[PDB]
Amino acid sequence: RRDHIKDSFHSLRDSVPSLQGEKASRAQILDKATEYIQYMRRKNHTHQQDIDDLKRQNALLEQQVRAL
């Protein structure tokens, strides 16, 4: 199983962009993955709220184009 933990560590490591080209320690791999998930959750939330704003702006512009 310890070879599979080694491979899974390498797979987690390659998926974190701040760890590209660096052989970080196991603690640094876990820490950077935790920070990356934090960063991405806030980033996708901000994006989803931007998409909500665009849908509402477009819905109003459609109502302005209609009635004209």
Partner 1 sequence: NVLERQRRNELKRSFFALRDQIPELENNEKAPKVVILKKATAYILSVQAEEQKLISEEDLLRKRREQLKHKLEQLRNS
* Residue numbers at the binding site for partner 1 (CB under 8 A): 1, 4-5, 8-9, 11-12, 15-16, 26-27, 30-31, 33-34, 36-38, 40-41, 43-44, 47-48, 50-51, 54-55, 57-58, 61-62, 64-65, 68
> What spatial distance separates the first Cα and last Cα of the chain, rounded to whole Å?
69
Nearer to partner 1, 17 or 21 (CB): 17
What is the C-alpha separation between 54 and 44, in angstroms, rounded? 15
Nearest-approach distance from CB 35 to partner 1, in angstroms? 10
Nearest-approach distance from CB 9 to partner 1, in angstroms? 6
Residues with Cβ within 8 Å of residue 13, at least 6 apart in sequence: 19, 24, 29
